[PDB]
């Protein structure tokens, strides 16, 4: 079973040596808090969260790095290697990658002023990355709930609540105006715009996206508070102002007669939203976790020990 004391006798300062690294780099990176936890669903929605997203290309296996819903849009890397560093000069082959990485996305929330809490730890690093499964599950923008469902329900996040309370990220963070580019002026091949869109903001997104424009700008996945963790994302929900196709499904969907009551409970209640979102992100946490003696403790995150 994984345990939030894991590492309290062995490193009791890496949550703080994490911290520290985040701090620093968001005095240049503003983005880095909501970078890291994007990097830690993507790395749980693919064989569980055993840091297989962190390896890089060998003659033997394909980075997960390349696969569509990482290409060109997951980023810190470099970040992470920069705690693992100081982390393993503080406490030699001690804390995996897997669990680092769990730890930089509670303390990115943290720090972006979300809840506070000690993740379960005790995860191992895979012996390998896996592109083809990265491909077959990563959720994608242009899904229906339905699929958004599916998606969830395929790593073993069963509960609309997850996928509510999870959604949530989107309170802070960059989108590409790639993924939006249908919902603006051609979605669902009707060659209008996708009608659950807020008219108001819908001018607003065709300005900062327009037709033949730069696919690769990024733009706000929160127009209240951008760069802030709190509960706006779920009040933008409800005034059909979510920017990507499966945030406004949550509350717009046909599917949506589950999701509706937490989207509201969500934007209701800030506390309400935070304990959600904690369950949530533990029970990500601890999907397929290798644990004991399997997997390793990876020294340089980007390749297994040799
Ligand atoms: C429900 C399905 C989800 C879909 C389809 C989805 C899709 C995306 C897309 C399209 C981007 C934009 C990437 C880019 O343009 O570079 C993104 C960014 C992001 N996602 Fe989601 N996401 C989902 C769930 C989640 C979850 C569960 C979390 C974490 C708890 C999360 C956290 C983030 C964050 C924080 C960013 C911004 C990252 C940055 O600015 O570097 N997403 N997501
Ligand atoms: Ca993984
Ligand atoms: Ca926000």
Sequence with gaps: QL???????????????????????????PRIAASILRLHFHDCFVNGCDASILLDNTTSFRTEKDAFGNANSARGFPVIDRMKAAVESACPRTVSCAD?????????????????????????????????LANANLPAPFFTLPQLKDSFRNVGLNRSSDLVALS?????????????????????????????????????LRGLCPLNGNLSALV????????????????????????????????????????????????????????????????????TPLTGTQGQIRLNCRVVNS
């Design 168 to 204: 949530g990220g989107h309170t802070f963070g960059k989108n590409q105006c790639r993924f939006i580019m249908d919902r603006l002026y051609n979605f669902s091949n009707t060659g209008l715009p996708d009608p659950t869109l807020n008219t108001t903001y819908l001018q607003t």
């Design 220 to 287: 706000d996945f929160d127009l209240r508070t951008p760069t802030i963790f709190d509960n706006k994302y779920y009040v933008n929900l409800e005034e059909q102002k979510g920017l990507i196709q499966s945030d406004q499904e949550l509350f717009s969907s046909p599917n949506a007669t589950d999701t509706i009551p937490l989207v509201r409970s969500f934007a209701n209640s800030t506390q309400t939203f935070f304990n959600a979102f904690v369950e949530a992100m533990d029970r990500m946490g601890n999907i």
């Design 100 to 132: 680092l990485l769990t730890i930089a996305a509670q303390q990115s929330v943290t720090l972006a002023g979300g809840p506070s809490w000690r993740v379960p730890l005790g995860r191992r690093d895979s012996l390998q990355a896996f592109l083809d």
């Design 3 to 29: 345990t939030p004391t894991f590492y309290d006798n062995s490193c009791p300062n890496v949550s703080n040596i994490v911290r520290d690294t985040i701090v620093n780099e968001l005095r240049s990176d």
